[PDB]
Amino acid sequence: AVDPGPELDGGDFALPEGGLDDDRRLRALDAVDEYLTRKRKHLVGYQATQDMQGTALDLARFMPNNINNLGDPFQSGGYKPNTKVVERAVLDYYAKLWHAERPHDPADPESYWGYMLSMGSTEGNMYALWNARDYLSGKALIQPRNPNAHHPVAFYSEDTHYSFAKAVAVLGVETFHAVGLEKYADECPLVDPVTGLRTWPTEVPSRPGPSGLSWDGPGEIDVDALAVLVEFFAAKGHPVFVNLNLGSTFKGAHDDVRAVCERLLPIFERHGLVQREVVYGSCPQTGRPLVDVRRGFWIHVDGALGAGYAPFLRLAAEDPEGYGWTPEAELPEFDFGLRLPTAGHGEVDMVSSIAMSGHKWAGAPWPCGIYMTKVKYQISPPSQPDYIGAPDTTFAGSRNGFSPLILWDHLSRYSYRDQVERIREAQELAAYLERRLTAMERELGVELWPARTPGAVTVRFRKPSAELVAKWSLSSQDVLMVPGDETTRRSYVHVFVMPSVDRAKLDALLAELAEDPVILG
């Protein structure tokens, strides 16, 4: 019934040999603006903040500059039109927020190192897995018999973003599923709840919902299942990479990072993964190999979304009277401050890396974000180029130096208290949306299948008409309610309550949903 409005017409944008005159150019740019403006005002289906008027006014002035943050953020280098001083300020802010040790100091192994991304969190997840692959496999670091010792195995839940399947293929890192099928075909330690067979699952199971299966579950990793699987491979001598989702793509779930770490640390200690000798080369002499001591596990937090708000929710949880708000759900401790005792290695700082997207919670006009780790994990760069004047420590070559300005401007405009208010309002509006959807089910006598993981800023429900989906940029996911069986398909959409989503917007969507031909049946 509803109108998403006209798409852009390719004929208006065709670029001829002779160029376009000023009138045709302006007509085309006006068409783009009219399209983008309509869509941005109605987007509620993706985890991307849409309002940034203040930053546009503040930062339009920088568009004439070909800014390039080429090389490591902690040295200018030769390309002087760079914003690395701003980039370091942004990195410092998040280092504090995530309880990392600051300042960055190459002589302090425990201090943070990180950089701003030129893609989105895909770059941060790729970098994390590259960094972890090399660290766990014995490649040389920056700072000074078991056949599986150099064969890391990757673990993550079924709710993990597709960037990991991509990163694993790019980097040649083997998942527990691939290694299971290849080397350990009949030894899967988990029983499949559908078939009762010991078949290796493709990802670590997520927690079950009312169905007994993960499709209607919260989207959080099953800690028990993870621990069983990690023990299996750790006992075989494999080092371990674990990715944990802090604000998962479809359900906005938060893996219980503290619970995972508590449950895995004894496994790591039992199997000699807290501190182990690693050979990182050899030379022709009576003696040969070079050895150093490393951990044999790497825990990465994919906070693409959640690393931007979770610190603020946790601040309120710590001082609910001070912020005038008690969050309804507990968000897990997840950051560089998470430290656990051991039987005989002292306290262990559990997380090795975090990724976050700037175009998610904060909002940006293009993809950006942060990768952060510690100095002690940095890998020797792939080469030493004289011509950038700064080391090649990043995934990108040339880097977006406008993104530091975007995030700096944002962060400068809000206090911690203001940031707590933004996550509070989103949490409360997500709860409101869930309430209104069930009230709609009762008023109209229709099924909407609404679902919201406690503490998530997204609510899922039955997919409406294609036109409504297109108007409001609703993201879609199909599930089979019984894995394998194509007849059990349900189509869901979700709404992400970002800081640019307010009550009026949700009420306008809900009014259209109540008259939608698919919803009504």
Cβ proximity to ligand G06, 234 vs 353, nearer residue? 353
Q: In terms of CB distance, is 127 or 176 closer to ligand G06? A: 127
Neighbours of 12 (CB within 10 A): 14
**What is the x/- site pattern for ligand G06, positions 151-170, by CB under 6 A?**
----------x-x-------
Compute the distance between CA of residue 309 and CA of residue 255 in angstroms, rounded to an integer. Answer: 15
Q: Give the Cβ contact number of residue 301 at 10 Å.
A: 31
User: Half-sphere exposure of 186 toward its Cβ, with a 13 Å CA cutoff?
Assistant: 0
249 binds ligand G06 (CB under 6 A): yes
Contact 455, 220 (CB under 8 A): no
- Rounded to 5 degrees, what angle do the CA atoms 507, 479, 191 make? 135
470 binds, among ligand G06, a second copy, none (CB under 5 to 8 A by kind): a second copy
Q: Is residue 393 close enough to count as binding ligand G06 by CB under 6 A?
A: no
Binding pattern to ligand G06, positions 418-457, x when CB under 6 A? ----------------------------------------
Copy the structure tokens of residue 501. Answer: 């989503």
Q: Where are the beta strands (DSSP E) in 303-352?
A: 339-340, 348-349
The residue within the footprint of ligand G06, chosen from 52, 70, 242, 423 (CB under 6 A), is: 70
Are 351 and 334 in contact by the 8 Å Cβ rule? The answer is yes
Q: Which does 331 bind (CB under 5 to 8 A by kind): ligand G06, a second copy, none?
A: none
- Pick out residues in 452-481 that bind ligand G06 (CB under 6 A): 475
Q: DSSP per residue over 97-159, as a string?
A: HTT-BSS--TT-TTBEEEEEESS-HHHHHHHHHHHHHHHHHTPPBS----TTTT--EEE-BTT
**Quick one: what does residue 317 bind among ligand G06, a second copy, none, with the CB cut-off 5 to 8 Å set by partner type?**
none
Contacted by 302, from ligand G06, a second copy, none: CB < 5 to 8 Å by type: ligand G06
Query: Both ends of the chain: CA-CA distance in Å?
Result: 13
Per this entry, what is the length of the chain? 521
Q: Which of residues 321-380 bind ligand G06 (CB under 6 A)?
A: 357, 359-360, 367
Judged by beta carbon distances under 5 to 8 A according to partner kind, the member of a second copy, ligand G06, none in contact with residue 305 is: ligand G06
Residues 65, 57: contact at Cβ < 8 Å?
A: no
Nearest to 179 by CA among 222, 122, 239: 239
Q: Looking at beta carbons only, is 23 or 347 nearer to a second copy?
A: 23
Closer by beta carbon to a second copy, 40 or else 258: 40
CB of 302 to ligand G06, least distance (A): 5
Q: Is 48 in the site for ligand G06 (CB under 6 A)?
A: yes
Pairing, β 240-245 against β 297-302: parallel
Torsion angle, alpha carbons of 336, 420, 365, 357, to 10 = 20
Applying CB under 6 A, among 121, 400, 403, 419 the residue interacting with ligand G06 is 121
**In the set 43, 44, 47, 406, which binds ligand G06 (CB under 6 A)?**
47
Residue 47 interacts, among a second copy, ligand G06, none and using kind-specific CB cut-offs from 5 to 8 Å, with ligand G06
Structural contact between residues 355 and 369, judged by C-beta atoms closer than 8 angstroms: yes
Q: Which residues bind ligand G06 (CB under 6 A)?
A: 46-48, 68, 70, 79, 119-122, 125, 161, 163, 245, 248-249, 302, 304-305, 357, 359-360, 367, 387-388, 397-398, 475
